[PDB]
Amino acid sequence: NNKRAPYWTNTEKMEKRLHAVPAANTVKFRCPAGGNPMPTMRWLKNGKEFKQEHRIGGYKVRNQHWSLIMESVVPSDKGNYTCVVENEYGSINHTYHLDVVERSPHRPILQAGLPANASTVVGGDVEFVCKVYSDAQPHIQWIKHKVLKAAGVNTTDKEIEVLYIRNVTFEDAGEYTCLAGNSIGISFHSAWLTVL
């Protein structure tokens, strides 16, 4: 009749038990539950009551969507998160294991889509850009195909980012490369300046 012990309304969303993500990211655990009376939901971090004050920045809950959300995850968040749906006729639970991963120290990273190919008529001023993200000031150098500019003492970081080429020529046409690196590794992306 109208007696119904808690049941999973969407097993799919629950497929993924192990949640491994880069630090800083925001994780969300879901446990879609059905049951009449409507069940109630509560979360458990490593077996115990996951109280708001258990982590910096607490956590938001979405009753409507039977979920738990943690923003800017840190290594201290590592653990098992268990949902417990229950009403007078029974209870059900699921447990997610969270593994936050600090990817730093890591090689430089170049904002995809930069350097951006270019092309201009002789006489004008072409431009090239390379944005790099690294744990430490990245060693970056432009390589025209000889080494054009190169971040050091006479060239600062904000300067190295953009490579200008005033009043071009049909000689400047070619493959410009942005190579960047650090103690862990290096990456590099090219760009083509077509002369018209």
């Binding site: 497929e15 192990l18 491994a20 880069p22 593994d99 991963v101 904002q111 995809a112 590794g185």
Partner: protein
């Protein structure tokens, strides 16, 4: 360096090379054929091999992951650390096509032709041996 695990965000599995030579994904942290060994020829190029069946991950001419016993052209993957901090692996050989290493939400290989930049099937994260 040391053996790592190639966890795929999509379904949340570990990359796995089966003795059979079939490439899939499990969730068993204890399973043996997940202890991959990343080795890099040139910087940006790599060889992923099982520290058990000493098999090297490979992708044939139709974008289909398989375990090889003989390191060859179809064993070289381009390791790339994306803006969001996950890794994506591309077929050196079929690079032009943009054929990534991937796993469907059920932990089964994903054919290169049917993979792309936007898929969460192609995002991996190296994780400790244990």
């Amino acid at each position: 360096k040391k053996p790592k695990l190639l966890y795929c965000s999509n379904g949340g599995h570990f990359l796995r090379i089966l003795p059979d030579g079939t490439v899939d994904g499990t969730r068993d942290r204890s399973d043996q054929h997940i202890q991959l060994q990343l080795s890099a020829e040139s910087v940006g190029e790599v060889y992923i091999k099982s520290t058990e069946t000493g098999q090297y991950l490979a992708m044939d001419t139709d974008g289909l992951l398989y375990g090889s016993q003989t390191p060859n052209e179809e064993c070289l993957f381009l390791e790339r650390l994306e803006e969001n901090h996950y890794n994506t692996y591309i077929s050196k050989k079929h690079a032009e096509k943009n054929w990534f290493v991937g796993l469907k939400k059920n932990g089964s290989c994903k054919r290169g032709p049917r993979t792309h930049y936007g898929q969460k099937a192609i995002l991996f994260l190296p994780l400790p041996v244990s």
